[PDB]
Design a protein around this ligand. Structure first.
Ligand code: UA1
Ligand code: MG
Length: 280
C-alpha cells in the first residue's frame, strides 16, 4: 500500500519472484502506484493564462507543492520534501523558449546552486527542452538576470558546467544518455552519476533545493531522484524500500517513475549493488 520494505539479504529472491510469469507481481505492484498523489488539485496549472507555460497539457504541478515566482507567479515546477526537511528538490519540466527566464528567476529566488538535467534538448526529431543556458562563454541576459558560463567539462556520460549568475555560482550536471520513457544503458552508469551528484551536493553547504529536470520532469527526473533516495537507504539500513521511495515522489508530482521499465530498472540497480557487497 504505501511502502514495501525488503530485507537486503532477501532482496535477490524477492526481485526474482516479482519478475516471474512475465513481471506479473512487479506490474501489479507498479499499478498500485497509479492514483497516488492524485487526490490533490492542479487548479492553478489549469488556468487558461498558464497554458503556454506547460510543456505538456497532462503534466501539471499540484497547487499544494508548486514553486511560485515572487497568474504571473506560475512555473511548472514542484517541491519535493526530503526525509529531514522540506524542499530537498525542485523538480521541473524542460524550460520552453518563453519560460527560460522564469527558470533562472526560480533558480535565483530559490537559492539553487545545483541543477541536474537528465534529458537531451532534441530526441527522436522532437524538441524536448530548450537549450536554456549560454552556448559559449559570453555573458547573456535572461530577462533581468545575467548568466555566464565559466567552464564546461565534457565527461564520457555527463557534462558538468559552471555558471555565474547575478552574484552566485551554479553547477549543472547534464546526463547525456537516457532515452525518453526508457532507462540508461547500464545500472552502473546511473548509480555512478547519482553518487557523483550526491557528493557535490553534500559539499555544497547551504544551497537551496537541488533542481532536477528532464522533458516533462516526471519519468527520468523521478527515476533519478528515486535512485538517489534508494542508494542512501542502502548505506543506512538493512532493508530497502523501492516502492515507498516511488510512492513518496508521487505524493508530490504526477507520474514520477513514469514507465514500468524504469521501475524494473530501480530494482536492477538495487540487485546489482547488493550482489557486489555480498562477498565484500
Ligand atoms: C507518455 N507521454 C506523455 O504523457 C506526454 C508527457 C511526457 C511525460 C513524460 C516524459 N518523459 S520525461 O518525464 O522523462 O521527460 C515525456 C513526456 N504527454 C503528451 O505527449 C501529451 C498528450 C498525452 C499523452 C499521453 C497521455 O496519457 C495523455 C496525454 N501531449 C501534449 O502535451 O501535446 C502538446 C505538447 C501539443 C500540448
Ligand atoms: Mg530574453
Amino acid at each position: 500500500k504505501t511502502s514495501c520494505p525488503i530485507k537486503i539479504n532477501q532482496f535477490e529472491g524477492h526481485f526474482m519472484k516479482l519478475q516471474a510469469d512475465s513481471n506479473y507481481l512487479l506490474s501489479k505492484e507498479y499499478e498500485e502506484l497509479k492514483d497516488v498523489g492524485r487526490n490533490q488539485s492542479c487548479d492553478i496549472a489549469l488556468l487558461p493564462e498558464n497554458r503556454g507555460k506547460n510543456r505538456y497539457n497532462n503534466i501539471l504541478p499540484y497547487d499544494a507543492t508548486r514553486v511560485k515566482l515572487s497568474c504571473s507567479d506560475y512555473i511548472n515546477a514542484s517541491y519535493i520534501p526530503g526525509n529531514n526537511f522540506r524542499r530537498e528538490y525542485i523538480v521541473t519540466q524542460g524550460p520552453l523558449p518563453g519560460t527560460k527566464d522564469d527558470f533562472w528567476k526560480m533558480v535565483w529566488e530559490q537559492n539553487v546552486h545545483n541543477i541536474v538535467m537528465v534529458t537531451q534538448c532534441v530526441e527522436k526529431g522532437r524538441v524536448k527542452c530548450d537549450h536554456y543556458w549560454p552556448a559559449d562563454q559570453d555573458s547573456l541576459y535572461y530577462g533581468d538576470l545575467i548568466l555566464q558560463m565559466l567552464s564546461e567539462s565534457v565527461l564520457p556520460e555527463w557534462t558538468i558546467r559552471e555558471f555565474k549568475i547575478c552574484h552566485r555560482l551554479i553547477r549543472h550536471f547534464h546526463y547525456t544518455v537516457w532515452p525518453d520513457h526508457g532507462v540508461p544503458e547500464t545500472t552502473q552508469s546511473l548509480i555512478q552519476f547519482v553518487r557523483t551528484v550526491r557528493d557535490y551536493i553534500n559539499r555544497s553547504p547551504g544551497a537551496g533545493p537541488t533542481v532536477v529536470h528532464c522533458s516533462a520532469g516526471v519519468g527520468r527526473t523521478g527515476t533519478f531522484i528515486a535512485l538517489d533516495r534508494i542508494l542512501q537507504q542502502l548505506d543506512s539500513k538493512d532493508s530497502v524500500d523501492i516502492y515507498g521511495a516511488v510512492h513518496d515522489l508521487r505524493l508530490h508530482r504526477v507520474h514520477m517513475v513514469q514507465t514500468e521499465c524504469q521501475y524494473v530498472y530501480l530494482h536492477q540497480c538495487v540487485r546489482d549493488v547488493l550482489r557486489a557487497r555480498k562477498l565484500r
